[PDB]
Amino acid sequence: GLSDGEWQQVLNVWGKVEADIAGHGQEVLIRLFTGHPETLEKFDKFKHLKTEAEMKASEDLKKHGTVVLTALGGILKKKGHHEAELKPLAQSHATKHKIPIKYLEFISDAIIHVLHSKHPGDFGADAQGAMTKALELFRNDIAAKYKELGFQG
Numbered sequence: 001g002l003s004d005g006e007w008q009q010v011l012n013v014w015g016k017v018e019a020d021i022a023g024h025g026q027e028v029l030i031r032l033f034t035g036h037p038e039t040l041e042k043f044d045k046f047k048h049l050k051t052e053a054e055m056k057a058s059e060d061l062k063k064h065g066t067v068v069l070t071a072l073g074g075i076l077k078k079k080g081h082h083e084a085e086l087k088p089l090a091q092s093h094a095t096k097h098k099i100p101i102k103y104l105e106f107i108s109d110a111i112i113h114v115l116h117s118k119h120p121g122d123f124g125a126d127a128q129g130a131m132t133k134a135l136e137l138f139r140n141d142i143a144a145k146y147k148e149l150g151f152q153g
């Protein structure tokens, strides 16, 4: 798990996201979709987005970014004690949305990228380490639920 010090770092970094949840959420999804176009195909509601300009101009993409980061934020503030919050997400993403765990790796990496891109020189090495641990814990606990379900993709 994470130490108390590491959790404090995670939640301090998260304050950056909370100051502009929509902007961070938008950029995370754009980084995901542009880096990994196959991910867009999991979203029937974003398939029409054929250019990054269209992605940037999409109100609905910003809205979904807010939904995604709000859910993740709720999970992070549990400091690992997130079974009730994480179980339903793991199950909707495996059974309804059919999201391979690889894509959760992609979005985790996208969050780290966006934090550096929006806050260059202000996302320190200790902060990256702590946030990375938190995202790995999130992904790993989802992975355990995926295995229960026998879900691969």
Ligand code: HEM
Residues within 6 Å of the ligand: 039, 040, 042, 043, 044, 045, 067, 068, 069, 071, 072, 088, 089, 092, 093, 097, 099, 103, 104, 107
């Ligand atoms: C930080 C990781 C993620 C979080 C916290 C998250 C959260 C959410 C939430 C809260 C919802 C709405 C409720 C639900 O259906 O369970 C949702 C819907 C959805 N998610 Fe995610 N998600 C994440 C990653 C991903 C990834 C990587 C993909 C695809 C590559 C994905 C695809 C979808 C799809 C297709 C829906 C439904 C869209 C719709 O019907 O309008 N999610 N997600």
Ligand SMILES: [O-]
Residues within 6 Å of the ligand: 068
């Ligand atoms: O999502």
